[PDB]
Structure 1
Amino acid sequence: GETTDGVYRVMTRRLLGSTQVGVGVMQEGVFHTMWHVTKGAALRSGEGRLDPYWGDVKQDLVSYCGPWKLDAAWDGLSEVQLLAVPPGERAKNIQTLPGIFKTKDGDIGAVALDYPAGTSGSPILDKCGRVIGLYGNGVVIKNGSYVSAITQGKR
């Protein structure tokens, strides 16, 4: 299957027609997505198979063909870009200044952008094009708007 680095849609034919359930990142021969997109299932890439290699429900992350390779982090100051890949629509970059999720175990960057659930797994990038995390696990705040954590693994 296709091993070229880049952003990919994650699709299924189980439901009506062809449905986009999420998005992921191919980097250094490893496919990276959120756990809630695949539930840890195997994936097809052309005539090839991608098997899960590492995953964690609490982090809501999963890697295929090898260990998690994405290690860039938001610097806490600069604007970033969501490389949003929505269902049935072209990849589009949106620039934003992240907010913060404050937890009992430390702070994480968060982006306040709302896209269909099938956009989950889209990469958030820094100014050098490095992936600092994936979009799609977050919360619905007071006024009903969606805010996603910038979710990053550990390399």
Structure 2
Amino acid sequence: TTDGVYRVMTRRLLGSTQVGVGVMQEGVFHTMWHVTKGAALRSGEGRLDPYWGDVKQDLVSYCGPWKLDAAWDGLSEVQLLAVPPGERAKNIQTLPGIFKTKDGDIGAVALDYPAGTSGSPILDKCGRVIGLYGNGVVIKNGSYVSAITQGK
């Protein structure tokens, strides 16, 4: 439970499969709901039980309430700390676009990674996590745009 970015794995029959990614911060593990479907996790500290979650936000936290409070400033470039299955963690910089909804704008990143990259953190220049990657839409040419999803 040391601070950092973690892969979320499932053990299956022969070998493990990476289904997602999450962030440990202030003793709480943060990931996207569709990665774990809100089920318990094993860790070196023992079993992590779900504490908070919200299917509409597609988020879940373990061991405590959602701790990530930083937000995109609406202006600056951001970095996806992509942790793709079978690949080393890698930073990719981008200027977000915008998801325009009836209730307001959400920053969004036009970066396309494997499904198991879900939950990878998006950072501001201070290194604060401003959201998690992986809840998005497929646009007309088949490429992908992810919301910058932050716990409300």
Superposed pair shares fold, TM > 0.5: yes
- TM-score where L is the length of structure 2: 0.98
- 2:108 is aligned to 110
- 1:151 is aligned to 149
Tell me the percent identity: 100
1:15 shift after superposition: 5.0
Q: Rate the CA distance shift 1:132–1:15 in 2: closer, same or farther, 3 A.
A: farther
Pairwise CA RMSD:
0.9
Which stretch has the larger CA shift, 57-66 or 16-25?
Answer: 16-25
Q: CA offsets per residue over residues 93-128 of structure 1, 9 Å max, x none?
A: 000000000000000000001100000000000000
1:75 shift after superposition: 0.4
1:150 shift after superposition: 0.2
1:47 shift after superposition: 5.5
Q: CA offsets per residue over residues 41-64 of structure 1, 9 Å max, x none?
A: 000002611100000111000000
Q: Rate the CA distance shift 1:71–1:87 in 2: closer, same or farther, 3 A.
A: same
Q: Rate the CA distance shift 1:73–1:37 in 2: closer, same or farther, 3 A.
A: same
Aligned length: 152
1:16 shift after superposition: 4.2
Q: Rate the CA distance shift 1:109–1:6 in 2: closer, same or farther, 3 A.
A: same
Following TM superposition, the consecutive aligned residue runs of length 4 or more in structure 1 with deviations greater than 6 angstroms are none
Aligned to 2:84, what secondary structure does the other structure show?
A: coil
